[PDB]
Amino acid sequence: LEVAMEYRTVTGVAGPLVILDKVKGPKYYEIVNIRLGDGTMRRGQVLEVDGEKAVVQVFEGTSGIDNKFTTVQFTGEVLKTPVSLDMLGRIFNGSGKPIDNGPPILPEAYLDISGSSINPSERTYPEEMIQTGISTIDVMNSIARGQKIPLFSAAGLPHNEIAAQICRQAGLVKRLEKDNFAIVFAAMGVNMETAQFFKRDFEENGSMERVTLFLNLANDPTIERIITPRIALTTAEYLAYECGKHVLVILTDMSSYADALREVSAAREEVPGRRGYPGYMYTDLAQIYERAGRIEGRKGSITQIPILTMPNDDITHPTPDLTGYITEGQIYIDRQLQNRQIYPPINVLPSLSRLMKSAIGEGMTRRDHSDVSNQLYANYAIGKDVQAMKAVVGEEALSSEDLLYLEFLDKFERKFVAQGAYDSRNIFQSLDLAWTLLRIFPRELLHRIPGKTLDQYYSR
Amino acid sequence: YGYVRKVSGPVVIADGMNGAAMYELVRVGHDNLIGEIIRLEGDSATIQVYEETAGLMVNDPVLRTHKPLSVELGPGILGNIFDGIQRPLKTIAIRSGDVYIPRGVSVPALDKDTLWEFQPKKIGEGDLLTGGDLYATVFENSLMQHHVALPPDAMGKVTYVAPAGQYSLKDTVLELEFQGVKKSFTMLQAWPVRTPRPVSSKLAADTPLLTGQRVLDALFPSVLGGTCAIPGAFGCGKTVISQALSKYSNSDTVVYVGCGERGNEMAEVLMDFPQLTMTLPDGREESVMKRTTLVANTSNMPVAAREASIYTGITIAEYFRDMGYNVSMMADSTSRWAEALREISGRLAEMPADSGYPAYLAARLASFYERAGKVKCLGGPERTGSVTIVGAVSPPGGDFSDPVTSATLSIVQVFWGLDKKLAQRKHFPSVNWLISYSKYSTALESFYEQFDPDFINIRTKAREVLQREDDLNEIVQLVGKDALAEGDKITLETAKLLREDYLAQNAFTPYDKFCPFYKSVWMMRNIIHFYNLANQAVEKGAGMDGQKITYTLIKHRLGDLFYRLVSQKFEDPAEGEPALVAKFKKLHEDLTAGFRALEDETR
Amino acid sequence: LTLDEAIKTTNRRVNALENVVKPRLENTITYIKGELDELEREDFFRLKKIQG
Prior knowledge:
The structure is cut from a larger assembly and holds chains A, B and C.
Chain A: E1 6-7, E2 10-14, E3 17-20, E4 31-35, E5 41-49, E6 54-58, E7 71-74, E8 80-83, E9 91-92, E10 109-112, E11 123-124, E12 130-131, H1 135-138, E13 151-153, H2 159-169, E14 171-172, E15 181-190, H3 192-201, E16 211-217, H4 222-241, E17 246-252, H5 254-267, H6 281-289, E18 293-295, E19 301-304, E20 307-309, H7 318-326, E21 329-330, H8 335-339, E22 352-353, H9 369-393, H10 400-416, H11 427-438, H12 454-457
Parallel strand pairs in A: 9-16, 13-20, 15-16, 15-17, 17-19
Antiparallel strand pairs in A: 1-7, 2-3, 3-6, 4-5, 4-7, 5-6, 8-10, 11-18, 12-14, 18-19, 21-22
Chain B: E1 2-8, E2 11-15, E3 26-28, E4 36-40, E5 45-48, E6 61-64, E7 70-73, H1 89-95, E8 116-120, E9 127-129, E10 134-141, E11 144-149, E12 156-161, E13 165-167, E14 172-178, E15 181-186, E16 189-192, E17 201-202, H2 214-218, E18 227-230, H3 237-247, E19 253-256, H4 263-272, H5 305-323, E20 326-330, H6 336-347, H7 361-369, E21 375-376, E22 384-392, H8 403-409, E23 414-415, H9 420-424, E24 437-438, H10 445-451, H11 455-478, H12 486-502, H13 517-540, H14 547-556, H15 559-567, H16 577-593
Chain C: H1 2-51
InterPro entries (chain A): ATP-synt_VA_C (IPR055190), ATPase_a/bsu_AS (IPR020003), ATPase_F1/V1/A1_a/bsu_N (IPR004100), ATPase_F1/V1/A1_a/bsu_nucl-bd (IPR000194), ATPase_V1-cplx_bsu (IPR005723), P-loop_NTPase (IPR027417), V-ATPase_su_B/beta (IPR022879)
Domain ATPase F1/V1/A1 complex alpha/beta subunit N-terminal (chain A): 10-76
Keywords (chain A): Hydrogen ion transport, Ion transport, Transport
């Protein structure tokens, strides 16, 4: 019922910031619209306020602003994103404006982004598996609804192809156990060409009733790149706990998000933190991640698979080393496997899930999941060791078991890991492939497999 | 209007500006230096001077212009050399006999008195025209026609179109009436240096670059309208790759904007390209100066001019793409550009970020690179054109942790990472095949399939061979080749042959000056076929030995084929495809004769 | 003879080479982080003091 005053007291412009003069009673994170002298419109966010002063960070840059013709019309808001159940199946810009040639969202609620945290008393341990279609993920590094598992990558590695495959093939394992699965897909600072890739994948996927592609290009303004993952997390939280639907979220290149936070912090004249990244970057990433988890009072859940780029192909970088503690896993993409032309280059042996035991079980998935996972792990290690030995022992002195492990390693690299870009694989047939590889060894040789399982499956 | 208050380096604070918008170019002092606004604090506004600031007074008048940094477009833009602020260098050198560039010279970017021929594109009176519609064509020079289009911000009905004949830029070649008012248009078109030209819609590239060099065109390809990044190396890199992209590329024109580089190198480039008789047409030897353009700004040039040079270069790319040509712009800058940002940011008292570079470096590099990509043009007829950005990165003396390098690799799609170790070994194309990558390998699937339906498999096999050799190099560094088996030995032999035959190129001789795609793919297929047949033979194990014994057998009793394989690089492209293809097919047949004749007597 | 040669090489690698490299890595880490990072904060802190 209050029409916000449109101050015209610009008294300083520098970089992305504009300092108003005599604003009456601002708000710290208010949102403000700017009508330049030429009539064009820009939206800006309000940073630190002071006595009658309010520094405004302006989207889309600050070119053309003049201290005698630019009006700064306040709103008195904190960026309540419009949220509704029909937000699904549409592509959205970085700031939420639809770009799918459709109408703006008619909202069932205006939820403020950066939502309040879950009460730790109300959380519940994650359970059941989430089928992704990639054998290396659903066999040896299983994923459970409620985890927060990073996908560590590096520049040049095909992170986005794996992202698209996860977005398309994701499903619920409980099909044979006896459709409330939604995939909020967030992409921060993608390249100009991969934008076409994402648009094509989300324009011919075949399951559009599930995904919601929040998209933020590289040349889009930075503050949009900060807000985009928060918008995506808010929409996912709504669709999970306010609509009782299982939700999966893929955050692409959160290293770009960290760089965006670094860019914003510097503009506020704050001293840079450790290794250049601000010290509050730990708090920011914890705020982004911890929104996941399973709530006892709600039937929904949030599972995150944030894709992170590790610069210089090492984990010592502040962002991967920092996100290692918060999360409970690491699915590395290995450069050498990409060189070896294995399309999913996931280094399975280095990769692990800190809580992969919950996904493995009797009710969910299949009984032999843990046994086959451990056997595959151990046999791969042995095969790698045997290949290394054969590199130096001439391979003539290798015993029969050494040759068995060598051929198993070759088969595992060239038939199991190298899944096609579109070869969707249910966990049951993935485990059938695992048993196909395993049955080469004698039944007595599979030491890691417990009894009553070999008799069940080793007979094929 | 306004007067100077403070003069520190290239940063000038002039009071009395009041209503002076950001980036609104102002003219400083009696000498009338160009200059752009960078900050405001009230009645005063910071200015970047783009020129030497020595001799500025206090209360020296500063005149505002209300116009952001703008470059003047039109005919004759091709084949010229422009300063970062787009001053015609040759025009300055001729009009003023002095060999120097005088301070504060005011020369039009394009000559306004040269007579140009006008060919209207059948536009009738009373017709309707719109932004970017292509109403007339002008032959700026032979083998490079220049279409003339309305500016994107223009529309109306065609009341008057000039007839065909000789015209100068001062004349009005077209008239339009819209919304009850009329406007006129000349052959000039001023455009802000930022705010990229409008595009009807972007597109996903399919055509490869197919550059002259074999490594680039085969292992790590780039698409027309793509995006690349080389580490600005000398001897290699900034010279051989620049020559290949300029005189031996399928791009319809070149825009060299290398700024912040050595003056001697710039003089060498600007004296060698005048002759440069590349056979760009089917049967013509027109010099590429009728095809390229330089925006050279040497290192000694003012620090504030680097960004202006880069943005004018990319803006010129856009004008040509809009006409329809597939321009390819090469920037030897962006290594000095980061330094320019550091200088201005520090002088403007901005808070630094990781490694001292301004926090918004990634944003600027993105706003530059993301202007690449092939684009469906504005206006009528329907048309398509592309812009390629083959930029530069810090030389291979610093790891990828460099903020400029990380920012580039976070955006750039193809990385031609040259390694200094290869440069020491005098391998001249010098691309490190372990660290380079090309994310365009998936979009080029159609072109590779239609050209040769088996090239993808042989390329993957070559990649696997190179990776395997690089993998066991460490093991050999410990134990040695004593334990190497038949497969390892043959893999290393093929890797060495690939390294010295395929991946090398002299480029100073007709053997390797320009390798067409067919010759490169034939070399790859020959080498991979030899590798596969040799592996199959050593796996056969006939004669109770096979293995490394068979490897020595094929390296000694069958080594003439090996020598012909390693000398296949010398197939002269001037002989023509029907001859080289026949020669390579014969060599393939002879190779198939081997490893079968070798298997005849069971080794 | 071969076992003696291999054992000598392995013992040399375990004792000399690795224990030579690891102090070098520690010294390089200390030189960068212990000095350059500390100086960068001190420089910026002095600059902020000048502004204040």
